[PDB]
Design a protein around this motif. Sequence first.
Motif, PDB file in Angstrom:
ATOM      1  N   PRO A   1      -4.150   4.865   0.842  1.00 32.94           N
ATOM      2  CA  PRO A   1      -3.787   4.542   2.231  1.00 32.94           C
ATOM      3  C   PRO A   1      -4.604   5.239   3.330  1.00 32.94           C
ATOM      4  CG  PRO A   1      -2.203   6.033   1.338  1.00 32.94           C
ATOM      5  CD  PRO A   1      -3.046   5.578   0.176  1.00 32.94           C
TER       6      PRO A   1
ATOM      7  N   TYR B   1       9.599   6.177 -18.953  1.00 41.31           N
ATOM      8  CA  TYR B   1      10.304   7.384 -18.536  1.00 41.31           C
ATOM      9  C   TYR B   1      11.837   7.366 -18.535  1.00 41.31           C
ATOM     10  CZ  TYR B   1      11.038  11.799 -16.000  1.00 41.31           C
ATOM     11  OH  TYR B   1      11.416  13.042 -15.564  1.00 41.31           O
TER      12      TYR B   1
ATOM     13  N   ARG C   1      -1.526   1.317 -14.343  1.00 39.40           N
ATOM     14  CA  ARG C   1      -2.558   1.258 -13.315  1.00 39.40           C
ATOM     15  C   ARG C   1      -1.988   0.750 -11.982  1.00 39.40           C
ATOM     16  NH1 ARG C   1      -7.848   1.936 -14.310  1.00 39.40           N
ATOM     17  NH2 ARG C   1      -8.162   3.612 -15.844  1.00 39.40           N
TER      18      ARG C   1
ATOM     19  N   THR D   1     -11.087   7.439  -7.629  1.00 38.67           N
ATOM     20  CA  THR D   1     -10.010   6.449  -7.738  1.00 38.67           C
ATOM     21  C   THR D   1      -8.972   6.979  -8.730  1.00 38.67           C
ATOM     22  OG1 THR D   1     -11.660   4.727  -7.448  1.00 38.67           O
ATOM     23  CG2 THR D   1      -9.495   4.039  -8.241  1.00 38.67           C
TER      24      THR D   1
ATOM     25  N   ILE E   1      -6.499  -2.094 -16.901  1.00 37.66           N
ATOM     26  CA  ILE E   1      -7.263  -1.877 -18.133  1.00 37.66           C
ATOM     27  C   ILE E   1      -6.288  -2.258 -19.245  1.00 37.66           C
ATOM     28  CG2 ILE E   1      -8.645  -0.005 -17.178  1.00 37.66           C
ATOM     29  CD1 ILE E   1      -7.063   1.964 -18.798  1.00 37.66           C
TER      30      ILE E   1
ATOM     31  N   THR F   1       0.876  -1.174   0.000  1.00 37.83           N
ATOM     32  CA  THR F   1       0.000   0.000   0.000  1.00 37.83           C
ATOM     33  C   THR F   1       0.923   1.236   0.000  1.00 37.83           C
ATOM     34  OG1 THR F   1      -1.497  -1.272   1.410  1.00 37.83           O
ATOM     35  CG2 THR F   1      -1.865   1.126   1.291  1.00 37.83           C
ATOM     36  N   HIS F   2       0.710   2.211  -0.886  1.00 36.21           N
ATOM     37  CA  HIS F   2      -0.478   2.365  -1.730  1.00 36.21           C
ATOM     38  C   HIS F   2      -0.697   1.447  -2.945  1.00 36.21           C
ATOM     39  CE1 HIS F   2       1.152   4.997  -5.153  1.00 36.21           C
ATOM     40  NE2 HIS F   2       2.189   4.535  -4.481  1.00 36.21           N
TER      41      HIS F   2
ATOM     42  N   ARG G   1     -14.539   4.160 -15.036  1.00 37.31           N
ATOM     43  CA  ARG G   1     -14.215   4.368 -16.462  1.00 37.31           C
ATOM     44  C   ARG G   1     -15.309   5.219 -17.140  1.00 37.31           C
ATOM     45  NH1 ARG G   1     -11.679  -1.004 -19.175  1.00 37.31           N
ATOM     46  NH2 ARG G   1     -10.613   0.689 -20.300  1.00 37.31           N
TER      47      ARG G   1
ATOM     48  N   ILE H   1       0.354   3.441 -10.508  1.00 32.43           N
ATOM     49  CA  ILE H   1      -0.380   4.561  -9.927  1.00 32.43           C
ATOM     50  C   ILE H   1      -0.795   4.208  -8.493  1.00 32.43           C
ATOM     51  CG2 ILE H   1      -2.519   5.915 -10.005  1.00 32.43           C
ATOM     52  CD1 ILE H   1      -2.128   5.853 -13.109  1.00 32.43           C
ATOM     53  N   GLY H   2      -1.062   2.921  -8.269  1.00 27.90           N
ATOM     54  CA  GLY H   2      -1.394   2.436  -6.947  1.00 27.90           C
ATOM     55  C   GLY H   2      -2.840   2.366  -6.547  1.00 27.90           C
ATOM     56  N   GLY H   3      -3.429   1.185  -6.667  1.00 32.69           N
ATOM     57  CA  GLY H   3      -4.816   1.020  -6.284  1.00 32.69           C
ATOM     58  C   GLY H   3      -5.857   0.745  -7.361  1.00 32.69           C
ATOM     59  N   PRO H   4      -5.878   1.494  -8.483  1.00 33.16           N
ATOM     60  CA  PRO H   4      -6.889   1.250  -9.523  1.00 33.16           C
ATOM     61  C   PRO H   4      -6.778  -0.091 -10.246  1.00 33.16           C
ATOM     62  CG  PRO H   4      -5.210   2.589 -10.431  1.00 33.16           C
ATOM     63  CD  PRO H   4      -4.896   2.486  -8.954  1.00 33.16           C
ATOM     64  N   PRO H   5      -7.911  -0.605 -10.758  1.00 24.34           N
ATOM     65  CA  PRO H   5      -7.869  -1.882 -11.473  1.00 24.34           C
ATOM     66  C   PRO H   5      -7.172  -1.741 -12.827  1.00 24.34           C
ATOM     67  CG  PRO H   5     -10.005  -0.898 -11.742  1.00 24.34           C
ATOM     68  CD  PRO H   5      -9.291  -0.096 -10.659  1.00 24.34           C
TER      69      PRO H   5
ATOM     70  N   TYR I   1       1.538  13.037 -21.195  1.00 28.43           N
ATOM     71  CA  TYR I   1       1.799  11.707 -21.716  1.00 28.43           C
ATOM     72  C   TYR I   1       2.900  11.665 -22.790  1.00 28.43           C
ATOM     73  CZ  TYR I   1       0.576   6.716 -22.679  1.00 28.43           C
ATOM     74  OH  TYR I   1       0.606   5.370 -22.923  1.00 28.43           O
TER      75      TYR I   1
END
Lengths: 729, 729
Positions: B360, A574, A354, B70, A363, A70-71, B117, A357-361, A539
């Motif tokens: 968190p 990056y 995703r 999110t 895609i 976590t995160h 989304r 970034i930490g946490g999102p599902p 981006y």
Amino acid sequence: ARDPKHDILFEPIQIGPKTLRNRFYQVPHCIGAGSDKPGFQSAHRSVKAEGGWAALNTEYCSINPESDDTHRLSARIWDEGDVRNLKAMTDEVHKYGALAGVELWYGGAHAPNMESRATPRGPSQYASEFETLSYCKEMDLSDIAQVQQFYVDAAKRSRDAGFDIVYVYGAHSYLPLQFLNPYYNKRTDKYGGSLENRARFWLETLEKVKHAVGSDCAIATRFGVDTVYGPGQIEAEVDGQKFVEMADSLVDMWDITIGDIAEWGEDAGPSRFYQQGHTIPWVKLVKQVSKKPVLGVGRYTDPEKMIEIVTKGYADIIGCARPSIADPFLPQKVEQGRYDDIRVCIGCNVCISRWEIGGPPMICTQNATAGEEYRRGWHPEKFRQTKNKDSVLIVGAGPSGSEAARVLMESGYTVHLTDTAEKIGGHLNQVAALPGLGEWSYHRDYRETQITKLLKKNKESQLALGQKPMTADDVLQYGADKVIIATGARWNTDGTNCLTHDPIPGADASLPDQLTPEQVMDGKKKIGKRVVILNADTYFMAPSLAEKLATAGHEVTIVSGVHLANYMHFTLEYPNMMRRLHELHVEELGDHFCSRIEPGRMEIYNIWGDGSKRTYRGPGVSPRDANTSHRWIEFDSLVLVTGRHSECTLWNELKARESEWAENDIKGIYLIGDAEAPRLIADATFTGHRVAREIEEANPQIAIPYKRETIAWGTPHMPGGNFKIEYKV
Amino acid sequence: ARDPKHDILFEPIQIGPKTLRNRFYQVPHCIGAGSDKPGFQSAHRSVKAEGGWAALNTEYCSINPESDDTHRLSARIWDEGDVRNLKAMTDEVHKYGALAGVELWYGGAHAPNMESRATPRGPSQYASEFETLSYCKEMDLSDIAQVQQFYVDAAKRSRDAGFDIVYVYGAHSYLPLQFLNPYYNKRTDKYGGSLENRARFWLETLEKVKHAVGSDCAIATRFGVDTVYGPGQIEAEVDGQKFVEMADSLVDMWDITIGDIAEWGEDAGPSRFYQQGHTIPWVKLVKQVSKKPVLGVGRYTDPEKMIEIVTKGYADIIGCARPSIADPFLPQKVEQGRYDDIRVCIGCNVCISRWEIGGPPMICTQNATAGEEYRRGWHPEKFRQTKNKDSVLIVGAGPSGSEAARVLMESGYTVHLTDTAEKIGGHLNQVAALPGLGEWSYHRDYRETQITKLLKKNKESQLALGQKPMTADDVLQYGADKVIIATGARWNTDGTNCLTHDPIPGADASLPDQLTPEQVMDGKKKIGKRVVILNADTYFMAPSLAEKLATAGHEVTIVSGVHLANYMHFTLEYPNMMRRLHELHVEELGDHFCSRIEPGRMEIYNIWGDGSKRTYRGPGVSPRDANTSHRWIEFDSLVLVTGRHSECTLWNELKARESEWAENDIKGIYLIGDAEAPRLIADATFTGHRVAREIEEANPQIAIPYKRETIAWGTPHMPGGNFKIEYKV
Ligand SMILES: Cc1cc2nc3c(=O)[nH]c(=O)nc-3n(C[C@H](O)[C@H](O)[C@H](O)COP(=O)(O)O)c2cc1C
Ligand SMILES: Cc1cc2nc3c(=O)[nH]c(=O)nc-3n(C[C@H](O)[C@H](O)[C@H](O)COP(=O)(O)O)c2cc1C
Ligand SMILES: Nc1ncnc2c1ncn2[C@@H]1O[C@H](COP(=O)(O)OP(=O)(O)O)[C@@H](O)[C@H]1O
Ligand SMILES: Nc1ncnc2c1ncn2[C@@H]1O[C@H](COP(=O)(O)OP(=O)(O)O)[C@@H](O)[C@H]1O
Ligand code: SF4
Ligand code: SF4
């Protein structure tokens, strides 16, 4: 029919006490589910089991609360609640005859422990180069025994959960690798110094895990054989091969990777820098000294490449992560000879972004069902067939339009897809022309291939390309039951940006010395020697154009009002991107934006130029001292990359004339993709997929609810636990 | 007994159909719970209800899936599952006689919608200045009707959940504010242009919400009265006051804030920049034209200040967020006259940093129980009393040792706290002396005050400061049953950093031209004119030292190998910090680190100087072209801020002599705080609080498990829903 050359990919292979039905293996990889989203975890893995994959693994699985990411979201095998949740996945994977595996993880200081607040332990005390504020405690001998015990306990819960394969995870610079690598290990006792000593922690852990579950489970180990940093860390022909020889008898299968954690894009190679099979030089070095089955990822999507590494003795198994996300049915399609139905991964790393970034599902740019299998009930290869004869007109054949077309056709509807452009692909045809983005065209190649073959199944369906722009009247009198407007977006031409939400005085792309990304890519408009790219996007556009132009001999300076290439941190592109811009001598002026433009020159200012002190000075006056950092810089050509706007004129006209819809037997008109709001290609593709799946709902413009995986108050995660508030007094 | 002057703070006040028992109000604020962690949500709010707060509000609560924050975590009131989960909170709050409120939220493009989304909608199409890759669809008249309906449905669900107060959230540049603000609203219809047109969306929404639940619930509106950007956005004496006049008849109470979302640190003022009551100049302007109860946050912790704003007519209620996190019992302590027991918030914004990071749970530098009430059963004012007579020796009186001492004494143990330093506070005494960090002292003032008072209750306990350093022999023969080593950490003196984990050749803080943070703060060692700060830490040390030295006349250059002040993005101090450094002419050299140091000069290199292409060139050779960006820079003094290391010498000796513990009747020795591993002050405080609470456990060195709030497979979030995988075919 399958090409006989590919038969070898379907021979079983023994890994310890287990047998893989074929050579297709899904290595451990994040998806944003862990043990927190049991439905997502089981559906995503089981569809692949149905798709033919021999074995499915979870992502890194924390063995104890003191290794809490976590995160970021990892799986967890801490207690009985985790065993229950993860079993849903092993049960569903077994249903389709595949094996299930878990990757036992302990991260050292790389795990920030933001949830647990526990103290991580490591070979020596260091502050992680990945999580710069996270430090660990140096382990004494009892610390070592205790952490080794965590692994044993975790391995045991894994067996209880139904896993057939248990990994001792030593890749991405995690614990076992930290002891092996002198970059982290500064110990002088029996766990440091010589290779024998540095290898000791890993060797003992393997032996203990094998002793606990080796009779019931295959014991695998994932190993970063080379950190790709040169001398100083792990080198394949130095410590790499020697460690393999040492541990060979304890392992049932070797799962190889390269790189560390700060730059794991060296492992998860973006197509921008690496081609399929990029890891071969390092991976083959392991087969050379091991006597056990070896596998090593390399963005494998082509059966020809797969048979090459196997017959040439570079590997015995085909390990994939991303290729399995893009196409869960890849093994079945190869087995059946359906090569043209394979949805090839474009190596964009948006799935990975995703997790970072930490946490999102998760895609996926290619597969709009990834992450949607459970919550929306979308199978990637099964579509609900229509019972009516409705016809649909789709204006625009870009990522959104073409995906909507493909799904509707698969569902049995009659569709008419039209575009002024000569080919399917929309804006993506220009994007794939940017340096290093060639493989992104697979997104449009797949839809072109699919739409073409789907046209043969319904003669009423039609594909009209290279046409005149559709107009409101054309649409109203077309005769389709429903219409989908997927007209896209264009890059701003007046300087409009996210910082001010207003145009910039003097910005006009119709002027001789100003260009938009489209004008640069068409390559007609002349570009002077000195180029300044004004950026407000985080981006790929600005850095990609900078690279393109610098390689063509221009002198490039990027003035960026937002963090340059920020999103690229998440896609893992990056580091190499910065190195590329550096070798090309691209000057970067971060933290600066533009206040006004004149022919051949622009006024810029530092975004942190206002006074630090806030004082109430009444209306009409700013509460901070004025920004006086303004200065002019010259240019031959100014490239504007300030933002995008939806191309929705057609939509607006149709909407204004909504009263006329009924008269023309038009049941509904929907707006999708970039035309609704500029999005990531992945989401543009998703909108098309969604309206197609929900074309029969009350209002296809807005999504219907999806199943939510959130705790229900009154139900404890711990079986038999008390969910009520209990203070220790 | 309470000072009579403070009686006014306990007079009830009518807000619509509801009555506040006193003037202490907890405004809505994030805690990292939302509707996903019902236990954490109900416990954290109810302890404050028990502590005397009149009303407790949830954090921003999403009214619909198209306003999904999110990766950040917000509450949600989308369906029945949410109503169930949120009711747990209202029931528990009502149990203590307080009102509960919910803050209805719709974010526009500010919500990245990474889980849903979905496509956000706003007054005009724009890319969020906060979420730069997030765009929204411009709303047409039906969109506006539909979104307003979302609010009505949410309000109705809220009433079902038992909420007494319902907010239409128009602060932090969220939806209702976007329509009112020209910065976002570029419309030319009846919803844009004039103030009455700009206010239309908010007015209509308020009216519909009032109509739906106004007889059962009090209707409040949170409003950012001035964006503090000057003309161009909302100004208090221009649109600000006028909107209040227009909406006054519709609202039961005004909750006022200042600033936007990108820089909401202007609202949640860090003590580094703002003092208690910093928002007054703006907040008072509202009461000037309103006839309803007004409240406006301002980090109010002092009762003298609280009565000043009320008696002076600046506000009717005391709204607090952070002060309530640091001390859930602030109201009760004021009511009983126990002013010295008040745990004053230091305005460090670490609680907030957790929300910004995304995901968190919240933590507090002052209150180690914040976020632990439910999962660990830790009540901030109630401690389990010991049944034995054990005495505990604690070496070190910094954040960790002093907190451990405080909690042990509260639990009834005999405690002996010692330090070589003259006063309690450890390294915090030097930190609070940095420019602007003076209020951080409250952390040590509080512990000094409490310890002093607790000594009176047990004559066996002792405080021994200004002592000679404790040695292993001293500890062994001291006579205590248990010992806690809390000896802290020190900044590295040899250049050791997170990038290489090794010293830097030539780095030695004993040389005349090199210094460590401690040497600079002591102010004894001479510092030359041209100062270079070598940084590898992402929090406050480098920037603060730079500010201190620049204001003293030095020419400062910061060479940073990590993102300078990155963690300050999360604490909301970054913007004002960067402006401060800019005013002070501090030069920054990011993306650079140091290979070697000599007298008066150092060799630096660009961290992205290696070649972008990776090629396997065998062992001994780097797979990338060599970095050749090295150049030398001069300095008079070099300040090293490369990292910290635990000062655990005493601990190491005691552990080596573990066989001697038993004979000296020592039952156990524990290592806490920075001495175990350098942590944030908040976590150092947490370790001390934890060993204290778990001193009687089998192994106090490692935390016992906490209640986990994760879904249990087999239980659907939607009551009556199906949890099994169901594909739509
Ligand atoms: C979305 C994603 C997340 C990842 N997380 C993990 C992880 O949990 N554990 C692990 O060992 N590897 C992780 N990987 C790395 C993959 O195991 C693999 O090494 C990488 O994607 C290269 O394989 P491919 O080229 O076939 O995709 C991740 C990869 C992906 C696609
Ligand atoms: C941890 C935290 C999270 C916050 N999130 C919210 C939120 O969800 N909604 C909201 O309106 N304000 C939010 N706030 C802002 C507070 O409501 C308040 O405006 C700010 O902290 C100033 O009040 P104080 O000075 O008494 O802390 C948040 C503040 C904190 C402390
Ligand atoms: N009036 C129109 N008639 C036909 N095609 C159109 C019209 N307006 C735009 N288009 C096409 O719509 C396509 C939009 O694609 P793109 O910009 O890639 O959007 P998305 O990413 O939403 O799929 C473009 O190929 C463009 O040529
Ligand atoms: N041997 C020792 N005897 C007594 N006090 C010590 C000894 N070594 C260090 N200390 C003290 O321990 C304290 C540690 O405090 P600090 O650095 O603030 O740590 P933490 O943040 O872990 O509480 C310092 O005040 C230091 O003087
Ligand atoms: S998101 Fe991109 S890199 Fe990831 S599996 Fe999909 S196409 Fe491949
Ligand atoms: S973490 Fe800091 S700013 Fe937040 S409530 Fe605690 S002392 Fe206050």
